[PDB]
Each structure stands twice: as C-alpha cells, then as structure tokens.
Design a binder for this molecule. Structure first.
Ligand SMILES: Nc1ncnc2c1ncn2[C@@H]1O[C@H](COP(=O)(O)OP(=O)(O)OP(=O)(O)O)[C@@H](O)[C@H]1O
Ligand SMILES: [Mg+2]
Ligand SMILES: [Mg+2]
Lengths: 145, 43, 145
C-alpha cells in the first residue's frame, strides 16, 4: 500500500494544487506559506475529531463561499499479495472496486456551504474510479473509514 | 521597581512572534526611556 | 403540536422511567437525584452539538455497559391544518408514517457500547409505530432532524 497523490481545491490558501506523495513525507518552506494548512487538509479528510465540526467561513479560499472544497487522496494497492495493510483496506471497501485487478483507490471529500445555516457540511466518498465515487456508508457518528 | 523593567518573552504562525517582537520593542522604546530594560528571551 | 410522553429506558440515574409530558413543563425535586440528566436526555436527542460526542462508559446505569441506552419521545400530531409545526414535522419525515396511524410520532435513540474502541455510538430512528422504526437519513454530519 502506498500514498500516490493528493489534490487540494479551494481550501484556505490552496486554490488548485497537486502533490505526489509517499509513505514518508517531509514538508518545508517559508513562513505564512501553508505548511500547517497542508496538514489540516489531511486532518479534515482522515481524522474524525475535526470532521465533525464542519467548515467555517474562514476555511474557504479568500473567504467566499461560492466555490466548493474538494480534497482527493490516491492510494496504490499493487502489493496486495505481500502487505497486510492492503487487506485491511479491501476488507472494509468490499463493494466499490470495479475491475478484477484494480490497483488504484480514491478517497475524496466535498464541501458546499449553506448560507442560511452558515455551515459547511463535509461529504466523504471512496472508490476505484474517479467518475464513479459512491458515498461511504455509516450509522450514527461512525462511518467506515 | 523604579530602576529595572524586565521584559520576558516566551512564544497563522511565525509572523505573530515577529509582530510581538515589534510590539515589545515599540513599548520598550516608547514607555521605558527612564528605566533600565532587561530582556529575558526563552527559546 | 404537543409532547405526550418520554421513556428513558437506560441512562445515568434512570433504570426504567416513563414520564407523561406536555408543552410548557417544569421539573423540580430534591438535590442530587436527577433532573439535569433529564435535560441531558433532551440534549442528547435533539441538540446536535451534544449528540456529536457520543456516549462514554459513565453514561450507562451503574457502569454496567452491557445494556442498551434507549430514549423515546412521543409527539401528538392530532391537530391538522391549525398549527404550522405539524406541517413542519410532516414535510421532513416524508412517508415513514402510515395513514392508519395519522396522529402519533416516535423519535427514538438507541446506543450500544462497542467495547473495543470504547465508544457508545448513538443511532437515531423515527416512525409512526413503536415496532418497525427506520433510521433517520443523513448525508454528512447533518441529520434530517
Ligand atoms: N482562508 C484563507 N484564504 C486565504 N489565505 C489564507 C486562508 N487561511 C489562511 N491563509 C493564509 O495562510 C497563512 C497561514 O499559513 P500557515 O499558518 O499554514 O503557515 P506556515 O507555513 O505553517 O507557517 P509557520 O511555519 O511560520 O508556522 C495566513 O497568514 C494567510 O496568509
Ligand atoms: Mg505553521
Ligand atoms: Mg442540577
């Protein structure tokens, strides 16, 4: 199992960025450049302690709410026969993989604002094709990621 | 306390610490002309 | 239109409690017996910001943690085309209700301890009959309630 790519759209100071990754990643740069905002896009995608609070007005790019937030993470599953983490992924996502030898996987986040509630809902999706993402099933406060 | 004034400094981010340095140096230049100023900077 | 009944089946102080209710109701009593766990039973049912943190081990009766927390609220919708709040309920519930019983509503809360991740998940259901309660549909962190 290997991280391959992340693509961040309209989240804080990132308008449209695309970053290839690995298992071990080191982020560096200047001050007020977005190293903490890069790590909080992974916190909103994968950590459930931040995702339950939703998005405010200040999490949007230049504070306007007419653009949606979309964060997509790509995983490579080409070593299923040797690694146990790949089976830990596949045993939860047992219905959404399309081809018989699908080596890619996509976990995505979309967010559209509500002006009357003033709330940004977070909807998560997963799958093997980029145009055929289904919603993650869940019951109560727990989903399957 | 009529002689020494002690300024103790202990700290998005990055620019707020430099802005706090500008606030502390502006207050030391303005309000403390008649005192001996000792800075105590922690990391 | 009118609240009829609450049934706290398992909570912190309550072993089997069934209280008839009304609109505009006042709860009193001695010190250190209940009556803010009565108000926490209504915050865990209807307030989202208390509901989003789940249940701990200390929210079960006598720390027994093998029973199911169940909080059921009964609403009386007998008056039709006189109050706007009944139409506000029926325009969101859709058809979980039945035309044989077009008068009573049940909003229920169930919770079982996971005992591996040590977390009590809150699953909310609504229905016109007390048996065959279906789940409340939700998209992200937003419920239909
Ligand atoms: N919603 C937003 N829209 C546009 N820009 C934003 C938004 N939120 C934050 N920023 C920008 O991001 C900056 C903060 O970036 P961040 O805290 O991630 O930097 P950093 O690289 O981690 O800094 P340091 O290493 O110095 O701690 C702000 O000063 C602002 O310029
Ligand atoms: Mg930072
Ligand atoms: Mg009290």
């Amino acid at each position: 199992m290997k991280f391959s790519n992340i693509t961040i759209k309209n989240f804080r100071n990132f308008e449209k960025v695309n970053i290839n990754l690995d298992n071990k990643n080191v982020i560096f740069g200047m001050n007020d450049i977005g190293k903490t905002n890069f790590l909080y896009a992974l916190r909103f995608l994968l950590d459930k302690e931040i995702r339950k609070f939703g998005f405010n007005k200040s999490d949007y790019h230049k504070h306007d709410t007419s653009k949606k937030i979309e964060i997509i993470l790509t995983l490579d599953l080409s070593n299923y026969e040797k690694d146990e983490d790949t089976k830990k992924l596949i045993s939860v996502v047992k219905g959404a993989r399309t081809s018989a030898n699908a080596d890619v996987f996509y976990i995505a986040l979309e967010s559209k604002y509500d002006d009357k509630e003033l709330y940004g809902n977070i909807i998560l999706k997963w799958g093997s094709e980029l145009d055929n993402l289904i919603d993650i099933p869940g019951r109560g406060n727990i989903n399957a990621l | 306390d009529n002689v020494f004034k002690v300024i103790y400094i202990n700290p998005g981010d990055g620019r707020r610490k430099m802005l706090s340095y500008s606030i502390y140096n502006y207050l030391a230049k303005k309000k403390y002309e008649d005192k001996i100023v000792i800075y105590l900077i922690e990391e």
